[PDB]
Amino acid sequence: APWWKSAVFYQVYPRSFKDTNGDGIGDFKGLTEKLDYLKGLGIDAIWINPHYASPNTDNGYDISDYREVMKEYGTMEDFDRLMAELKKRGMRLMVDVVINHSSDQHEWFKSSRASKDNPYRDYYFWRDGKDGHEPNNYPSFFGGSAWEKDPVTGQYYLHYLGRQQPDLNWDTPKLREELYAMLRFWLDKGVSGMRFDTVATYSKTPGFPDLTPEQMKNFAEAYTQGPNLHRYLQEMHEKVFDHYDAVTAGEIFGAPLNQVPLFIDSRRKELDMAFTFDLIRYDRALDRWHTIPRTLADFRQTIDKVDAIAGEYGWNTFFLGNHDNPRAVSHFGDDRPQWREASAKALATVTLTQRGTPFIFQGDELGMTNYPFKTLQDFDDIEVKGFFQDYVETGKATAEELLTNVALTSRDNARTPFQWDDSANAGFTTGKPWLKVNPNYTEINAAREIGDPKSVYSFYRNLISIRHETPALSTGSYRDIDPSNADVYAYTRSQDGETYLVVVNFKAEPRSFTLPDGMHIAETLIESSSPAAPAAGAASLELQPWQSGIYKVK
Numbered sequence: 001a002p003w004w005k006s007a008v009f010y011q012v013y014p015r016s017f018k019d020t021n022g023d024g025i026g027d028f029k030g031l032t033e034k035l036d037y038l039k040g041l042g043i044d045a046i047w048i049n050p051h052y053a054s055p056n057t058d059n060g061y062d063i064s065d066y067r068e069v070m071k072e073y074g075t076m077e078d079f080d081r082l083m084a085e086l087k088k089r090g091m092r093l094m095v096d097v098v099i100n101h102s103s104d105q106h107e108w109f110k111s112s113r114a115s116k117d118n119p120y121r122d123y124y125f126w127r128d129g130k131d132g133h134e135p136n137n138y139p140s141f142f143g144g145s146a147w148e149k150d151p152v153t154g155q156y157y158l159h160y161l162g163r164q165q166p167d168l169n170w171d172t173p174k175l176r177e178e179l180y181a182m183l184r185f186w187l188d189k190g191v192s193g194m195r196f197d198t199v200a201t202y203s204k205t206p207g208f209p210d211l212t213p214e215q216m217k218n219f220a221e222a223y224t225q226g227p228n229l230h231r232y233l234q235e236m237h238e239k240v241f242d243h244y245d246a247v248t249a250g251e252i253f254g255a256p257l258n259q260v261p262l263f264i265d266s267r268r269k270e271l272d273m274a275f276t277f278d279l280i281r282y283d284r285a286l287d288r289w290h291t292i293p294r295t296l297a298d299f300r301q302t303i304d305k306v307d308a309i310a311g312e313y314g315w316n317t318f319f320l321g322n323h324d325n326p327r328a329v330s331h332f333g334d335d336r337p338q339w340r341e342a343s344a345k346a347l348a349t350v351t352l353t354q355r356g357t358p359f360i361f362q363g364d365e366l367g368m369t370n371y372p373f374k375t376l377q378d379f380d381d382i383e384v385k386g387f388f389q390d391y392v393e394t395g396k397a398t399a400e401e402l403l404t405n406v407a408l409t410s411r412d413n414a415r416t417p418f419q420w421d422d423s424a425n426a427g428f429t430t431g432k433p434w435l436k437v438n439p440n441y442t443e444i445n446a447a448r449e450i451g452d453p454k455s456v457y458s459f460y461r462n463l464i465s466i467r468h469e470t471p472a473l474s475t476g477s478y479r480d481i482d483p484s485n486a487d488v489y490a491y492t493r494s495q496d497g498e499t500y501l502v503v504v505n506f507k508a509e510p511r512s513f514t515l516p517d518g519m520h521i522a523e524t525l526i527e528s529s530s531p532a533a534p535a536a537g538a539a540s541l542e543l544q545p546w547q548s549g550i551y552k553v554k
């Protein structure tokens with residue numbers, strides 16, 4: 001089994017991790033200075049968000065030169081030093097790869113847009129408008145049409161994401177070759193992994209027909225149905241990843257779950273691991289800014305479906321948080337002051353006992369929460385400006401309705417600065433932070449958590465040790481004990497004759513749990529929020545509100 005199947009990854013959003021020069025923005029020196037912190041937590045590998053030259057209309061996801069580092073993060077020597085310090089500690093780097101689209105400030109795009117006849121014209125998608133308007137009805141994730149007119153040629157260019165993020169044209173062989181050369185530039189430096197942003201949208205539909213009214217309400221899914229998608233992923237593997245030893249993982253956003261095996265079945269020679277969004281978006285409405293109430297039965301049934309698509313030859317990541325989603329404890333747990341620590345531990349237990357490679361998002365090991373936004377001016381999020389354009393300016397919603405609802409879903413909840421201690425701005429910066437620090441940093445910070453054996457951080461650290469010592473808990477089979485139960489989540493992990501039971505109360509009330517007939521507790525590995533372990537031989541358990549536990553059975 002490869003190293004990445006048993007590894008524990010941590011995701012660093014460098015903009016918000018640690019600033020070392022007072023400009024309010026996190027940087028490479030900051031990340032490098034905190035490597036001992038991450039080593040001591042027990043992290044094997046870090047995934048960093050984009051670190052390349054960028055105008056930052058979308059905080060690194062609009063890249064203007066793929067072979068230079070972002071000015072705010074440091075220099076190429078700072079990147080090289082990050083790499084060297086990771087290696088000293090036996091840790092690996094995964095970088096973010098953003099090749100569905102570039103910045104409109106990339107030299108390819110400046111050349112492409114200049115005339116119709118130039119060698120870069122087909123690096124992007126340029127099309128004539130139809131019947132007085134855009135080439136078709138495609139919407140953009142970030143507001144308005146996915147087509148933007150350029151008066152120089154009178155044609156429109158495609159952008160699924162922001163106006164400043166034109167889509168790259170994978171149908172053009174010279175363009176594919178340029179992307180492959182660029183990937184080699186980074187892999188030659190020794191990076192150990194690559195995470196592919198919106199990997200399912202690379203192939204565009206020939207002819208760009210209109211979306212149907214059905215497709216229009218779920219456009220994210222129509223954009224994943226390009227006919228050449230797997231041909232491109234296979235060619236990238238053959239020309240690039242076959243020559244290296246790096247792991248690959250795809251952000252498969254918008255794809256129907258039954259198509260996921262095409263990306264990750266190891267026999268297909270495409271990607272190694274999947275990030276899927278069925279679970280993290282399980283309670284999101286189609287418009288992406290409302291929430292729909294769900295129960296633990298929905299949570300566990302979604303997991304069971306995602307596990308089944310990995311089958312025998314594929315592999316899943318597991319995550320409860322990332323830079324595009326609200327905080328795990330607020331979203332899946334209960335972030336009220338009395339339940340925040342109990343429920344954040346319960347979610348740690350879930351995260352670290354799933355079948356797949358877990359990714360811990362920066363700050364979740366502290367039990368960091370959603371941010372108390374007060375006005376729409378408190379959001380940096382360009383996705384929020386897009387909802388304002390699509391919903392407030394059009395009269396569909398008031399500003400107060402947008403505010404109330406996006407406060408719960410906005411990705412800026414995940415982007416507030418990491419809370420290091422209780423000094424000014426939580427020790428993130430000596431200057432003014434680019435996004436405000438959550439005021440609860442006085443109660444939620446790394447310095448106070450590390451020093452307390454009973455903290456959320458200590459629980460994460462202890463779980464990571466246990467997982468490392470117990471192979472069933474990464475590579476073992478997974479079986480949900482009762483998918484209909486909406487109160488208590490329970491499942492087994494087994495490998496090579498060893499079976500482990502995981503039991504997690506999702507109610508803020510006491511609950512009982514009866515083990516399957518014949519199964520008995522043999523040993524308790526760890527519990528959260530419990531006054532007493534069960535007795536060896538127990539056929540049932542009494543659970544405190546939000547209690548979690550791992551037990552060896554038989």
Ligand SMILES: [Ca+2]
Nearest residue numbers: 019021025027
């Ligand atoms: Ca800085």
